[PDB]
Amino acid sequence: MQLNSTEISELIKQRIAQFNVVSEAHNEGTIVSVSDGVIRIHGLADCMQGEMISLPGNRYAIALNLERDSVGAVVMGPYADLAEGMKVKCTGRILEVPVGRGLLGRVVNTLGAPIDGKGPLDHDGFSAVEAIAPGVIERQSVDQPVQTGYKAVDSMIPIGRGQRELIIGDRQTGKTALAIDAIINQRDSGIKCIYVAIGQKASTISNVVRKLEEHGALANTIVVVATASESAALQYLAPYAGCAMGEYFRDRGEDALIIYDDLSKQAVAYRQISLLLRRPPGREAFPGDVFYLHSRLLERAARVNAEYVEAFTKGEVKGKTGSLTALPIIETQAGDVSAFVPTNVISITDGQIFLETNLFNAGIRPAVNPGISVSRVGGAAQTKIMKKLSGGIRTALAQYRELAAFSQFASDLDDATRKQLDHGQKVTELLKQKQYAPMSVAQQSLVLFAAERGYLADVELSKIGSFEAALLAYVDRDHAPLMQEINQTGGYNDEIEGKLKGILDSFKATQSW
Amino acid sequence: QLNSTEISELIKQRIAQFNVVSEAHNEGTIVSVSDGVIRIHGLADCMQGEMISLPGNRYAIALNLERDSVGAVVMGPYADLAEGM
Amino acid sequence: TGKIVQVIGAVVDVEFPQDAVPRVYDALEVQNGNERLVLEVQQQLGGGIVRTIAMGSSDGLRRGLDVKDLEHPIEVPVGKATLGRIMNVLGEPVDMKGEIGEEERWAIHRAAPSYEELSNSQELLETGIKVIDLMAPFAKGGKVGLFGGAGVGKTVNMMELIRNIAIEHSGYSVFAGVGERTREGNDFYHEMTDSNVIDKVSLVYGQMNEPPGNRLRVALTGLTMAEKFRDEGRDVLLFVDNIYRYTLAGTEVSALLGRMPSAVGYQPTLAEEMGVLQERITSTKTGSITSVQAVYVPADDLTDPSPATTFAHLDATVVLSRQIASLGIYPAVDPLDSTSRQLDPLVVGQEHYDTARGVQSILQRYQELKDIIAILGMDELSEEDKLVVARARKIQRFLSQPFFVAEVFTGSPGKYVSLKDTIRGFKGIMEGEYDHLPEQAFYMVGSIEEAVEKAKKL
Amino acid sequence: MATGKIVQVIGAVVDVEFPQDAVPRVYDALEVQNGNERLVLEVQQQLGGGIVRTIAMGSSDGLRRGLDVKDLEHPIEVPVGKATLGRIMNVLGEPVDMKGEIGEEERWAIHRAAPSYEELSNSQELLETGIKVIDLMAPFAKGGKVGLFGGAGVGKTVNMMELIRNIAIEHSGYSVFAGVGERTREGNDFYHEMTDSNVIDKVSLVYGQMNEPPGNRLRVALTGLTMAEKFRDEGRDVLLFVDNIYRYTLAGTEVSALLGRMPSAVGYQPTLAEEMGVLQERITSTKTGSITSVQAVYVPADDLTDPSPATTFAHLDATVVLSRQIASLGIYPAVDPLDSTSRQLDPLVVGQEHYDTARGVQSILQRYQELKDIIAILGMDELSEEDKLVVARARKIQRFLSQPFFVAEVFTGSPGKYVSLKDTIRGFKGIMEGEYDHLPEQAFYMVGSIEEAVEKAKKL
Amino acid sequence: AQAEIEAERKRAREELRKQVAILAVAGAEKIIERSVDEAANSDIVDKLVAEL
Amino acid sequence: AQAEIEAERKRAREELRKQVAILAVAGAEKIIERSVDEAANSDIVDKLVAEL
Amino acid sequence: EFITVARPYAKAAFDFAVEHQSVERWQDMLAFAAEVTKNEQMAELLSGALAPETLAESFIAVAGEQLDENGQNLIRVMAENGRLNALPDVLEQFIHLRAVSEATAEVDVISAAALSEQQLAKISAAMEKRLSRKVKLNAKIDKSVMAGVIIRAGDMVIDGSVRGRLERLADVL
Ligand SMILES: Nc1ncnc2c1ncn2[C@@H]1O[C@H](COP(=O)(O)OP(=O)(O)OP(=O)(O)O)[C@@H](O)[C@H]1O
Ligand SMILES: Nc1ncnc2c1ncn2[C@@H]1O[C@H](COP(=O)(O)OP(=O)(O)O)[C@@H](O)[C@H]1O
Ligand SMILES: Nc1ncnc2c1ncn2[C@@H]1O[C@H](COP(=O)(O)OP(=O)(O)O)[C@@H](O)[C@H]1O
Numbered sequence A: 001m002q003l004n005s006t007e008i009s010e011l012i013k014q015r016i017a018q019f020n021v022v023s024e025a026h027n028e029g030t031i032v033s034v035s036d037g038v039i040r041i042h043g044l045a046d047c048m049q050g051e052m053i054s055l056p057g058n059r060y061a062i063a064l065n066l067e068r069d070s071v072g073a074v075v076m077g078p079y080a081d082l083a084e085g086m087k088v089k090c091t092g093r094i095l096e097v098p099v100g101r102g103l104l105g106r107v108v109n110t111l112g113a114p115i116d117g118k119g120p121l122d123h124d125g126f127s128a129v130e131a132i133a134p135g136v137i138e139r140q141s142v143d144q145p146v147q148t149g150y151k152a153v154d155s156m157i158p159i160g161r162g163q164r165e166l167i168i169g170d171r172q173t174g175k176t177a178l179a180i181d182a183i184i185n186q187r188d189s190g191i192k193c194i195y196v197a198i199g200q201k202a203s204t205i206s207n208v209v210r211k212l213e214e215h216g217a218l219a220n221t222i223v224v225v226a227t228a229s230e231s232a233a234l235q236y237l238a239p240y241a242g243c244a245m246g247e248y249f250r251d252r253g254e255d256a257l258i259i260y261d262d263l264s265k266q267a268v269a270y271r272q273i274s275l276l277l278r279r280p281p282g283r284e285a286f287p288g289d290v291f292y293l294h295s296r297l298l299e300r301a302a303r304v305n306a307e308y309v310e311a312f313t314k315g316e317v318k319g320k321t322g323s324l325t326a327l328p329i330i331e332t333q334a335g336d337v338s339a340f341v342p343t344n345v346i347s348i349t350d351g352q353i354f355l356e357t358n359l360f361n362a363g364i365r366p367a368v369n370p371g372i373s374v375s376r377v378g379g380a381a382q383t384k385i386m387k388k389l390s391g392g393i394r395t396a397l398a399q400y401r402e403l404a405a406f407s408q409f410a411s412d413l414d415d416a417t418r419k420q421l422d423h424g425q426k427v428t429e430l431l432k433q434k435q436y437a438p439m440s441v442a443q444q445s446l447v448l449f450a451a452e453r454g455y456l457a458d459v460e461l462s463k464i465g466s467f468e469a470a471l472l473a474y475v476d477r478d479h480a481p482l483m484q485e486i487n488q489t490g491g492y493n494d495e496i497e498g499k500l501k502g503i504l505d506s507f508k509a510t511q512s513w
Numbered sequence B: 001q002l003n004s005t006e007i008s009e010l011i012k013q014r015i016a017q018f019n020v021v022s023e024a025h026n027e028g029t030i031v032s033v034s035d036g037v038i039r040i041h042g043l044a045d046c047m048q049g050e051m052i053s054l055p056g057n058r059y060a061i062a063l064n065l066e067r068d069s070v071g072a073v074v075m076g077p078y079a080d081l082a083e084g085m
Numbered sequence C: 001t002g003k004i005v006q007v008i009g010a011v012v013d014v015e016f017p018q019d020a021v022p023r024v025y026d027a028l029e030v031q032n033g034n035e036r037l038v039l040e041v042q043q044q045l046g047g048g049i050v051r052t053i054a055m056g057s058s059d060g061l062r063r064g065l066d067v068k069d070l071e072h073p074i075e076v077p078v079g080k081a082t083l084g085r086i087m088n089v090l091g092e093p094v095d096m097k098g099e100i101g102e103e104e105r106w107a108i109h110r111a112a113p114s115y116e117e118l119s120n121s122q123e124l125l126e127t128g129i130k131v132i133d134l135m136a137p138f139a140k141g142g143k144v145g146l147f148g149g150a151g152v153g154k155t156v157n158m159m160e161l162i163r164n165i166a167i168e169h170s171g172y173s174v175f176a177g178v179g180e181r182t183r184e185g186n187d188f189y190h191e192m193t194d195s196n197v198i199d200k201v202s203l204v205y206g207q208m209n210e211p212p213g214n215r216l217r218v219a220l221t222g223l224t225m226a227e228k229f230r231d232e233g234r235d236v237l238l239f240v241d242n243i244y245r246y247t248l249a250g251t252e253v254s255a256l257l258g259r260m261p262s263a264v265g266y267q268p269t270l271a272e273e274m275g276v277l278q279e280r281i282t283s284t285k286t287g288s289i290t291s292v293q294a295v296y297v298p299a300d301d302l303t304d305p306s307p308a309t310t311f312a313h314l315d316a317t318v319v320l321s322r323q324i325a326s327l328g329i330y331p332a333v334d335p336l337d338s339t340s341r342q343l344d345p346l347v348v349g350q351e352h353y354d355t356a357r358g359v360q361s362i363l364q365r366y367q368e369l370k371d372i373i374a375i376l377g378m379d380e381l382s383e384e385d386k387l388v389v390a391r392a393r394k395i396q397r398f399l400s401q402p403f404f405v406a407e408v409f410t411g412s413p414g415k416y417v418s419l420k421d422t423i424r425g426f427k428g429i430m431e432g433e434y435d436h437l438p439e440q441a442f443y444m445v446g447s448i449e450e451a452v453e454k455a456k457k458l
Numbered sequence D: 001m002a003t004g005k006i007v008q009v010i011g012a013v014v015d016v017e018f019p020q021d022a023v024p025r026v027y028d029a030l031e032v033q034n035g036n037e038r039l040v041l042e043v044q045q046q047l048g049g050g051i052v053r054t055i056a057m058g059s060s061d062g063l064r065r066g067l068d069v070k071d072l073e074h075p076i077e078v079p080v081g082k083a084t085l086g087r088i089m090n091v092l093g094e095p096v097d098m099k100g101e102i103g104e105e106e107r108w109a110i111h112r113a114a115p116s117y118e119e120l121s122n123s124q125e126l127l128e129t130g131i132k133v134i135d136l137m138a139p140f141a142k143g144g145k146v147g148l149f150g151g152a153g154v155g156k157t158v159n160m161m162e163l164i165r166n167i168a169i170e171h172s173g174y175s176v177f178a179g180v181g182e183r184t185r186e187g188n189d190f191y192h193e194m195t196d197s198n199v200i201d202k203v204s205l206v207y208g209q210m211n212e213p214p215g216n217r218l219r220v221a222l223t224g225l226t227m228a229e230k231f232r233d234e235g236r237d238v239l240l241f242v243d244n245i246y247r248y249t250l251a252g253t254e255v256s257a258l259l260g261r262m263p264s265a266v267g268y269q270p271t272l273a274e275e276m277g278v279l280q281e282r283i284t285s286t287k288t289g290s291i292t293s294v295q296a297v298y299v300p301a302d303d304l305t306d307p308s309p310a311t312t313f314a315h316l317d318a319t320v321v322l323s324r325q326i327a328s329l330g331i332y333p334a335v336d337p338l339d340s341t342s343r344q345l346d347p348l349v350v351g352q353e354h355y356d357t358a359r360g361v362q363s364i365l366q367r368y369q370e371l372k373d374i375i376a377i378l379g380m381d382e383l384s385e386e387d388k389l390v391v392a393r394a395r396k397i398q399r400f401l402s403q404p405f406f407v408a409e410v411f412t413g414s415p416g417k418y419v420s421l422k423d424t425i426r427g428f429k430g431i432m433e434g435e436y437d438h439l440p441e442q443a444f445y446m447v448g449s450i451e452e453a454v455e456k457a458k459k460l
Numbered sequence E, F: 001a002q003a004e005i006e007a008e009r010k011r012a013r014e015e016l017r018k019q020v021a022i023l024a025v026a027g028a029e030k031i032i033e034r035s036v037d038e039a040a041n042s043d044i045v046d047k048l049v050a051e052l
Numbered sequence G: 001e002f003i004t005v006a007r008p009y010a011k012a013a014f015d016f017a018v019e020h021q022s023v024e025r026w027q028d029m030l031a032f033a034a035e036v037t038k039n040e041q042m043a044e045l046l047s048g049a050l051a052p053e054t055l056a057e058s059f060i061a062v063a064g065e066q067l068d069e070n071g072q073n074l075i076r077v078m079a080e081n082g083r084l085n086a087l088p089d090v091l092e093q094f095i096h097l098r099a100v101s102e103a104t105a106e107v108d109v110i111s112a113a114a115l116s117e118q119q120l121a122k123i124s125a126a127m128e129k130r131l132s133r134k135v136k137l138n139a140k141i142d143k144s145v146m147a148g149v150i151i152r153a154g155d156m157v158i159d160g161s162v163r164g165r166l167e168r169l170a171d172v173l
């Protein structure tokens, strides 16, 4: 059907019409050197720093240095076919990226070119890749919750719209899983999502996209991809492109969520670009401004008050506050949370989720290590019910987990510590959760209810999981109105507490599990 | 390839007369100021460790005696200094 | 009257006529398109060239632009008119209120007060924090510094000190945000405005989004206001949000200024760039400045050149450690490294001094046993080393305290513990009069009566 | 017609100056008459003024300044296809055995871009190697990378020969073996050990060993990889062996130092991760075919945090660890089941039964590992009878991981066996869940499937 | 659906061969504002037709 | 499966558009070079120098 | 390459030549010096490590075309700094500073075929308005471009060729 050759022809026919043949003057230079992806251009007396220089073929380079007699630029693509003497044209444009809600569902190169097969973009103009985040007076305190699918992080480590929450851990610990589950969970909650893949294997990205499409989320995400074989200047500039695409929503009074797949590999690609320019390195051979690199990036994930949205959008949007929520991922060699780049980023974000390999190998997944992981915005970001039921649960587990260190050999006070152990242990057996199985705040809330009110002190550690499955089926059959209510509101009251206690006593009494 | 304080008008002076007269080996002129180190042009009779006297009542210690330059460190607040003094 | 000739990152080179070359630290100006960019010159290269740092985004600058030489350094509003308002590094107002009605403007580069003018004070300052004013008491008009890695508590501790010292203090206050989060600046501004203390605090903010020049000079912009309030005869509080960023911004620019790298890639002028600032934040015979500085230590390395050179400039140094925070013991102060110039028998009396040194001796003796305990287990200790260990763990617990600014985290209400009330509790724990209580009876409590009262519930 | 002239020579780095408009492009090949033989140079950089800096794919002794240099218009090109099976070649694709010319008809450039995003296979198969330990504990993804961390004296090369045999007979795939910077002595006897097992006609060999100048050791892996790409384009499933990836890193470090670039993390080149990725990203399963890779990895200073191991492990899927111990006990292949791992072991990819079977045998063996610690200090009869059963099942599981290879017949006499996956899952479910408890452990040793273990117990 | 689409592709292509020759002329007459005759190109348009 | 079908349709439509698109410019170039002449060339240079 | 180390010397030579109203003599003197630098034997001597005041004198010996005071002094300074090889670029930047001072420019006009000499008149009249400078033209012919014209004036170009129109249409699609 939709291979309407008539439309395919009229499409090109319009272009032949809306095309201007009039001459235009431009400024020109010559490539003088080529090495390891860096270009040295002589001429361009009118180039400006940060500019896009257009090369033969459909390719660009970014002007980094304006030396006295030459321009230094990095090629954004395969550089091998350039040669001394080729002419280059100075476009009057600072580095720019297509932006718009028409990107949703597209897989895109860091320059905005679509790398899937589905043809050109529909986009609302261009945005600058390097910008300065809103000032101190434009922000607003983060208030609204962002729900992942996971009991562990939604209870212990809440994330709010406008927050920045580092996911850090060793390799093969479930970082990408814990991130794309959060992306998938926004499938219906009105938050646009963005996934930036830096230095990832291409097969991994194709599988991630296939799973995003499997669960229906792909229609709500933008995927910006710069694979391991891509130039170091595309890996280094990718997350700025992703942030430029998210600020489009932030500034129009909407919400977005952006995920940087590795900001360790961005730091490594920047270290490459920097050492190839002979810049003196510092600690661990990273440049001096490796902090500023991540700082000026992550400082854009903000929440902005309604006056900023009004003034930016020229008065078209009233009373709404936009936000952009960031989940950068960092990889830590041998569980070292104390190396130059992991600490630089722990020093920028508003918390961190630390995934521990010892817990991950012991089958505890997601392996959220409490005590090291925190949310600097705290409970202000949770729903009223979740804030109530959770309490200080995470420090309760953080205690239980060290108590398991000394109690490993022997223990005194050996009843209260005995019941403390049993409780914490059943709760840990309760927090582990299967991948791709998100659960709404109603389910998490009634499960945390069961856990807190002592309703699980009967059943064995062996039974927990089927207990939860049966409970979530029971309340799915019976109390769907109460679920429809708690999912619609913060939903805490003595009335709802009574309804929950009644559901709990009744299930334990007559239900199968 | 980078310059060594070969600059337009100093070169023009030599174009006018290369073998400049021995006008005064006793004095020179500041050509650079940065981070408390000044580069002095002239001072053919400077000695290593010698005290050099600047405008105001301030001094510098000649530490680098090079081919057409003296590197000297200011013994006090330097930001007041300026090229050509 | 000058031309741009190079643009490398944040540093710009400008060429002027030979007779008009600007002086060092004079401020230039460029029309960066639909913008106005201020440059501050750092070096007079030869031949009329001058090398400058841009106080703003360097992107978009062409070569050959025309720059105008303002013949005065950067100058900021100062005095009573700047009170309760947020300002740039350039002294421009950043909140959406009108112009600053300042009467007078001061250059941000100044000489330190003479040795003749300094003053010294023994007058102790009391804070609600057990560990700080036991192990490291500090005095009115002196310097304090909080050393810590990333995310160990050196901002929460500073907000608690603000709460405990700054509301109960009559004079004015100044808060300089140097290269830290803008979220926290907005949070602090609204806390102050909603508690109606904002009319006594002056705020300068040069946060982490900004380019290197702003982070480089914002600390001097804040010191200039603190110095104006000092010279008026008042006594002032000066809080600096992270002084490490002030040297990091210098490291970022150093190599572009054409200077050879030093020990760990740091600028060669690290100790001088640091001293020239910290020598003018001092109290004097005409007025006093009390200052608290957060000091980030990179990669938790307390021997990195920057913390190592900072240590010497402070009276009381409080050292926060990650290995204590991971135990959930907040504030995570390390009592075997916190120290104070004020901890003398002559200044704090014999009882306070003696209790502090007893605590240190027990905790160090406990550190010495941690390896034998690790290898051979605890049952191999002599009958009295087990007593040392139990008391050391009780003391470790008891140094924890709940804060009014941490309710958002733990829910537990804050506690304010007076000094008289804490040296008594530690004398008790050490002398043995509380062996019966469990360890967890001491965790996160105020006075010692709360511990004996908490033991009743386990 | 030659146009360039050598202008500098410093070690292996040679600079040549061309007419201002004829400058070669990067990675283009050049050649010069180094006396009585020609020498090939590969461009690495373009400096200003028509000068181009190259690296010599050979010894640069005897090079004068001013020699004429001829600008070949294309990168180093090698012969590819069926014609290269059973031959030996060096970096430049020249026959290095004595058997004369290579009768190829097509030649490919060794520098290429990785498969684009829409060429990758939209599926995830498994490569059934036919070895029990590997297919149970560390399955291979078709198109994945496999580390092989064994030391010496454990049979790494006979495992390699067994994989080469199985993927040729039981599949219709060829193999390519790229020898990057290792002992020539080992290459000569790998060639013989393969020629006298009749697999030499199923593998294409390329060698750059330790005696070779740095450029050879650098580009030989790309030569091997492009021959494997030619085989992939025919629609086959191919297997690519790299003799040591660590030496492929070190050759790049040497070349980078020669070019004078600033050093990086622990002395490595600044472009370590990109040099590694541009290789490891070309071996993937495509909609037409696939290249699987088995790569021997050496970890410096036994430090898995060193930049080179750390960068390589970002690409490996599976990981098989050979152990001197498991060989001492007489079990071959000497794979260690407790340290071997594969990120294909997930219910969502390999299935639930295979997953929990592998996890079973893992837990059984890692308990036995400490029951045998008790037995050493306190003697056997100290054990509960709940444990004397675990020991007797662990011993049988441990035996059943042995297998006879078609390549090991020259040692064992017993005929080689190819065990399908289904058979291994059956056998280990059986042994674990107490079935077959009635027959002795030596009925499992070197047997093959379990249906053969019952017979070996019959005739025992 | 895949076989359906592979049939649809030929159905479309064999019509777009009629449009290639129109666009090739309109594009030139946009680039070269001395509007051009068909006659002189009637054979070139035919190889453009063919090669699609 | 029903969204994979649609993705296949989009991709096929795009490849067809790409082919027609490049044949259009190839044809326009051949038409141009077979139909440019001095009378039009002088008129083009006159146009651009009238706004040079 | 000596583009950068030549700027001070060209600027000094030009500022001196202006004071004495000898710009043309200086240009010819520099053009001769930059030629003696290219001779096969002299380019050998310029590379070997001779003492500056010996290399300079041997170089002076090969030129009676230099006004003994001011040209030889320039040679002696450049020799003291070790920069005699920079003369071929001192010449280019001297010509550039001259063309700037006298407000002159030189335009290349590239076309598929030679122009009608009325087109050239209008082109020069137009450019002398685009630029303040009195403009020469160098017409050049290149049959890759097939209609229209390219005007290149310094680093500015006006891509009036139909070849440009085609390549710029192809990338709209
Ligand atoms: N909740 C979970 N339950 C069970 N398995 C999980 C869970 N989360 C992740 N995994 C498993 O962990 C493995 C690795 O996860 P993932 O690839 O997301 O981690 P990663 O840190 O991104 O790894 P890499 O660093 O290699 O990208 C996956 O095979 C997945 O099956
Ligand atoms: N007194 C305290 N009580 C409880 N938690 C605390 C306390 N002080 C710090 N924390 C925890 O430490 C985290 C680190 O926050 P912060 O103090 O801002 O670190 P940084 O010093 O780097 O800013 C806080 O968000 C909180 O989780
Ligand atoms: N499958 C096997 N069957 C029998 N013997 C084996 C088997 N695998 C290894 N061996 C023995 O171990 C030796 C290992 O030698 P080799 O393959 O050269 O190891 P490496 O390459 O590590 O030096 C074989 O020669 C043989 O004696």
Ligand SMILES: [Mg+2]
Residues within 6 Å of the ligand: A175, A176
């Ligand atoms: Mg990952």
Ligand SMILES: [Mg+2]
Residues within 6 Å of the ligand: C154, C155, C180
């Ligand atoms: Mg902080």
